[PDB]
RNA sequence: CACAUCCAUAACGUGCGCCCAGAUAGGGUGUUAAGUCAAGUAGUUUAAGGUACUACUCUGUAAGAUAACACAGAAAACAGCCAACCUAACCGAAAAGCGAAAGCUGAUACGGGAACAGAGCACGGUUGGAAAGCGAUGAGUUACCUAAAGACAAUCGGGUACGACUGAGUCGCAAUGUUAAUCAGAUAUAAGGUAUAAGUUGUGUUUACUGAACGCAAGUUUCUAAUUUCGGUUAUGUGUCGAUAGAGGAAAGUGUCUGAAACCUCUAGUACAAAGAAAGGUAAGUUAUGGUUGUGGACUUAUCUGUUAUCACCACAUUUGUACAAUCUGUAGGAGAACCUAUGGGAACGAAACGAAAGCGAUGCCGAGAAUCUGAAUUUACCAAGACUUAACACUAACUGGGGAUACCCUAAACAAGAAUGCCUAAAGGAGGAAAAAGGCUAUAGCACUAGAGCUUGAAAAUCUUGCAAGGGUACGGAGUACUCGUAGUAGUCUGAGAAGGGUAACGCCCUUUACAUGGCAAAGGGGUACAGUUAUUGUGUACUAAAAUUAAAAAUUGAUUAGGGAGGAAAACCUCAAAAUGAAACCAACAAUGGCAAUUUUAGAAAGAAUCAGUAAAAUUUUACGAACGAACAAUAACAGAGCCGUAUACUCCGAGAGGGGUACGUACGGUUCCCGAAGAGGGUGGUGCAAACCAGUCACAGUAAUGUGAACAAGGCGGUACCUCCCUCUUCACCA
């Protein structure tokens, strides 16, 4: 019943110099206090924002251990942190994750608590972004197309997020408030103890099984720290950058970061040089390739998918700058899709996926229609719907082709094509097709 | 500058598939010698050919029509194709009799049947002249907007593949090829197919491995790749601003309106030349995934007497080069969204795909048409299958004969073997004297063990347990080294081989010669025969010491760095005060710079050290060393599912001038290789899981003389069943293979 670090943060020595938020909060505390105390946690096994879509298995506020916490029953648990991560099929961001145990199954909400602590008159932007998003995909909807100050857009390179870390200034700078300088010593017990397990003995970095689903939480935290001084540069920053070109938005990805107004080049020098000034001075991972020598013109580039623009293509450009679904993505995409030969002669095709005893075309309908949606669905704003369409064309022929292939007939492609499918009205119907293709293209996508 | 829009069709995964001899059971393969066959008219040469002509006939010669000549052809058959058709092929249900039904008997009448391939053994036979597919409605049954925006006009105003969807008439391919006819030689080692497996990744471009049985050999299909408003909508339409002329000037440039510096109308989208623009056909090559090799329609190649003719002049289209349009014209760069340089619009800039990569060479083959040159022939000169018959020869299977061990499953098996009366009238005598059977007579009621049946009977029974040779089928896709079983035979002069030397391949295999007796053969399948191998399993270490850098560091230390520990409601507190309700006091964690065990680095002694002795000679089987592993690996337990490839052939086919490819189970035999190894059902015997029916006064009290019978007591005295879980369980799909 750790209803106490609540105190250890809230009370926290308000006479002898303590908690950073001595400037925003003395009364925003008790609300979130009771939230943790009883609301998000009255019963960790049940009252949680946890793993069984709300919690772990039913534990009487952890019927065994977090019955109590103070005595260090789960004292400094390391949960030996094996290197392990998850990459998602778009909008480049691997996932900081590791083996969550009943302990971690609630450390999740624990650090979520400390998050809301660092949140209420503290935070900005739940996970990556500056305009608080709820998924990369939502971030992928929202954060992009809002500003065109002055030209010559930017890129961003280095990782420093699963490979290079401090983890010690990390836990300290934040410990200066609840881990009070005096009379509060039950704080960092796992903030530290995300103890990585690859014969190496750092912690809380290697997609920590100590806190697994919250490894992103701490990662986001340290990234927020990066931006805590992206601040000072944004102060120094758009002073003349909205002047060098103007006569007629610092990015927080979870992997890449560019800025607001641009337009000159010596400024780009300033950019990368200050980058270097703190890239090690803060992260200890440093600029690669001088991150971009910020680009004068625009270019067909990559930035989590909706390319920065300051026969699988078409001219779409203007005074206002615009996303681009970068074919680049689509290349690997269709590749791993493993359905279109790249060239019998500069030529794309259907091929099922070397799957000979395939499972049932019904669940294949599911597989496709799903991926169809998700792909197109999360594929919100992007210029050139065109190649999206030509994709969809191929993608579709793929679907029913795979289908017929599942049945070993006499070249049954057109048979299926003009027999089933939404066109010939395949319930077994596949209305998640061209119809649904531009249904999505319009719904929640133009929106 | 757009929304809708995109070729079909066989083989690979079934039967019979083991072998030992066939050799017309069907047959087939090919080989030869004998007969026929039929060739627009006739004759010719004299075969009775031929096609060779003589003259004459017919067809056609679109090379965008038109007459004539001059050019090429003209049977007959065989093969074959689609339709439809005994339905005997050949199968099912009834069917049939048959262990006594395990099953076996199905053309029995019915149904299907060119069986999904039987080619490696056919449903036949039959007719006729035809079956998808693909193009274009052959007619129409829905929409669709009617040109100047829509207003009512359907102004049929005009749009039928106008559109949703039924009728294709037509084609063409399907509905085709076979045929013997001057004789050579040279430009073939000609220009070109061509050497040469295999699998197992490394797949990173690496030129690796089994054994690679050829080397050398890495960059790589391409666009990056129409710039004369082809600038802004993909690969068709599909709207537009810009370029120019606004046109009419909507009352549509059709009657009902606003059109205006205009909706809306075409547009106002190089310079020429050149050609053909020719439709079709004839022949070649390109064509959407389970891949490879095929099969059709569509995509490019060439292709189609000349003349006398009448032609009867075609555009457009494109080709090349000129324009400059290039968004630049990227590439790479410097540099206000538009700028600037060698590009050159292909120069890496990429992209992509890849393995002894490609590509190249290498020396083993084929290498038509005989392309042509030149010889020669040249009685119209020549003339011998094209088929189909006969006669004979030789090979012959997946067909015939001869087969046949390894257990299996189940039934009788009268086989056996085992399963034999419950108490009385109460010695004497009888329950079959009354008892009540039991076992048993028809779902067998009683969800369960004596059919509710009367009871018989009172071993019989009919019960279990076993065997079940019987029977039948299970097993013949081969199936590491290993012997045994079944046979040393009928396979046997004649081929894994006689004996061998040679070549002999990666590799056995076949050449020189040797017995007639297994001589060499060497029988089949299926079983048993150890370690490969195999996954699992632990046991034991992943040393057994000691040495080989520390990650080691857990630690002690210390850098004792590192400061600090005050109910939990608490918002400068309220904490509840107490040395001190702040020394953190001396407990908590901070990396440990030294130790730091270890993961281990490797040496390792390996060899009577652990993890084997085989310990022999011999002590008597010990045995130092030495051969000997042994954590410096041994043991336990199940299984080994053909996927190929190279070489000799029943035969095959198809694709081919042939090579050489495709397959025909890794193809059938003998080698030699590499790689066999699950799911999903599933269907068996298991246990447990649970429950409940009881034959069995096993319990009720007992009628009792007991028994037989009395529903609790099935309170599971018990098979069982009973549903879940448990596992070798193919009985079907998994790639037979990008």
UniProtKB/Swiss-Prot annotation:
Region ranges (Intron maturase type-2): 317-447
Domain Reverse transcriptase: start-end pairs: 67-308
Obligatory cofactor(s): Mg(2+)
Keyword line: Endonuclease, Hydrolase, Intron homing, Magnesium, Multifunctional enzyme, Nuclease, Nucleotidyltransferase, Plasmid, RNA-directed DNA polymerase, Transferase
GO molecular function, one term: RNA-directed DNA polymerase activity
UniProt-listed Pfam families: AI2M-like_HNH, Intron_maturas2, RVT_1
EC number of this enzyme: 2.7.7.49, 3.1.-.-
Biotech / industrial applications: Mobile group II introns can be retargeted and used for highly specific chromosomal gene disruption in bacteria. Could be useful for genetic engineering and functional genomics in a wide variety of bacteria.
Reactions catalysed according to its record: DNA(n) + a 2'-deoxyribonucleoside 5'-triphosphate = DNA(n+1) + diphosphate
GO BP, sorted A to Z: intron homing; mRNA processing
Other noteworthy facts: The correct folding of LtrA seems to be facilitated by binding to the unspliced precursor or intron RNA. RNA would serve in part as a chaperone that promotes folding of the protein into an active conformation. Purified protein lacks endonuclease activity unless complexed with intron lariat RNA. It may preferentially function in cis by binding to the intron RNA from which it was translated.
Family from the record: In the N-terminal section; belongs to the bacterial reverse transcriptase family.
The protein's assembly and partners: Homodimer.
Function comment: Multifunctional protein that promotes group II intron splicing and mobility by acting both on RNA and DNA. It has three activities: reverse transcriptase (RT) for intron duplication, maturase to promote splicing, and DNA endonuclease for site-specific cleavage of recipient alleles. The intron-encoded protein promotes splicing by facilitating the formation of the catalytically active structure of the intron RNA. After splicing, the protein remains bound to the excised intron lariat RNA, forming ribonucleoprotein particles, and cleaving the antisense strand of the recipient DNA in the 3' exon.
Protein name (record): Group II intron-encoded protein LtrA
Gene: ltrA
């Amino acid at each position: 019943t750790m209803a106490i670090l609540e105190r250890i943060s809230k009370n926290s020595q308000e006479n002898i110099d303590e908690v950073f938020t001595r400037l925003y909060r003395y009364l925003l505390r008790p609300d979130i206090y009771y939230v943790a105390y009883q609301n998000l946690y009255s019963n960790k096994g049940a009252s949680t924002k946890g793993i069984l879509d709300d919690t772990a298995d039913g534990f009487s506020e952890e019927k065994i251990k977090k019955i109590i916490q103070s005595l260090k029953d789960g004292t400094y648990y390391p949960q030996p942190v094996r290197r392990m991560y998850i990459a998602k099929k778009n909008s480049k961001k691997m996932r900081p994750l590791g083996i969550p145990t009943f302990t971690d199954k609630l450390i999740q909400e624990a650090v979520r608590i400390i998050l809301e602590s660092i949140y209420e008159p503290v935070f900005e932007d739940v996970s990556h972004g500056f305009r608080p998003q709820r998924s990369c995909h939502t971030a992928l909807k929202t954060i992009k197309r809002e500003f065109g100050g002055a030209r010559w857009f930017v890129e961003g390179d280095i990782k420093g997020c699963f490979d290079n870390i401090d983890h010690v200034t990390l836990i300290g700078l934040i410990n200066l408030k609840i881990k009070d300088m005096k009379m509060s010593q039950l704080i960092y017990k796992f903030l530290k103890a995300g103890y990585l397990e690859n014969w190496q003995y750092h912690k809380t970095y290697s997609g920590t099984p100590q806190g697994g689903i919250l490894s992103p939480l701490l990662a986001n935290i340290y990234l927020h720290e990066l931006d805590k001084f992206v601040l000072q540069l944004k102060m120094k920053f758009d002073r003349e950058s909205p002047e060098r070109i103007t006569p007629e938005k610092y990015v927080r990805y979870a992997d890449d970061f560019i800025i607001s107004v641009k337009g000159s080049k010596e400024d780009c020098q300033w950019i990368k040089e200050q980058l270097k000034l703190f890239i090690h001075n803060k992260l200890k991972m440093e600029l690669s390739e001088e991150k971009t020598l910020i680009t004068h013109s625009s270019q067909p580039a990559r930035f989590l998918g909706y390319d920065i623009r300051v026969v699988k293509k078409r001219t779409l450009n203007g005074s206002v700058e615009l996303l681009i679904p970068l074919q680049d993505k689509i290349r690997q995409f269709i590749f791993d899709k493993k359905i279109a030969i790249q060239k019998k002669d500069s030529s794309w095709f259907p091929v099922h996926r070397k799957y000979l005893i395939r499972s049932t075309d019904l669940e294949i309908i599911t597989i496709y229609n799903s991926e169809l949606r998700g792909i197109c669905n999360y594929y919100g704003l992007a210029s050139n719907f065109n190649q999206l369409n030509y994709f969809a064309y191929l993608m579709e022929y793929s679907c029913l082709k795979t289908i017929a292939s599942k049945h070993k007939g006499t070249l049954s492609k057109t048979i299926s094509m003009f027999k089933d499918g939404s066109g010939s009205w395949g319930i077994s119907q596949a209305p998640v097709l061209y119809g649904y293709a531009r249904n999505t293209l319009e719904n929640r996508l133009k929106a």
